[PDB]
């Protein structure tokens, strides 16, 4: 178990999996709908 010191590069994920991401971190993670593909980007900030 390690704490991320600086924000990780965004990765593509499904809406169901990305909303889940938010349920753990939520101050520490960031998720957005990609308008064209309807999927979500998952970006882990510092402190994750």
């Amino acid at each position: 178990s390690v704490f991320l010191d600086k924000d990780f590069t965004f990765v593509v994920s499904s809406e169901a999996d990305a909303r889940a991401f938010v349920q753990f971190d939520p101050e520490h993670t960031v998720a957005r709908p990609l308008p064209d593909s309807s999927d979500w980007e998952v970006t882990r900030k510092a402190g994750t």
């Binding site: 965004f10 960031v30 957005r32 980007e41 970006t43």
Partner: protein
């Protein structure tokens, strides 16, 4: 088919130059959160 293959690589480089420089000026990318649309969607729902 297209000889342009190295012109695709030449796009990637400045993107890195762009991205790295953008972080120095603290210009924030990927700032879109849940603020406006769903509230409007809630209003449009009512």
């Amino acid at each position: 088919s297209a000889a342009l293959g190295e012109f695709a690589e030449k796009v990637t480089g400045p993107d890195g130059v762009l991205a790295s420089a953008a972080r120095l000026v603290l210009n924030q990318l990927g700032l879109s959160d849940v603020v406006t649309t769903p509230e409007a969607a809630t209003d449009a729902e009512l």
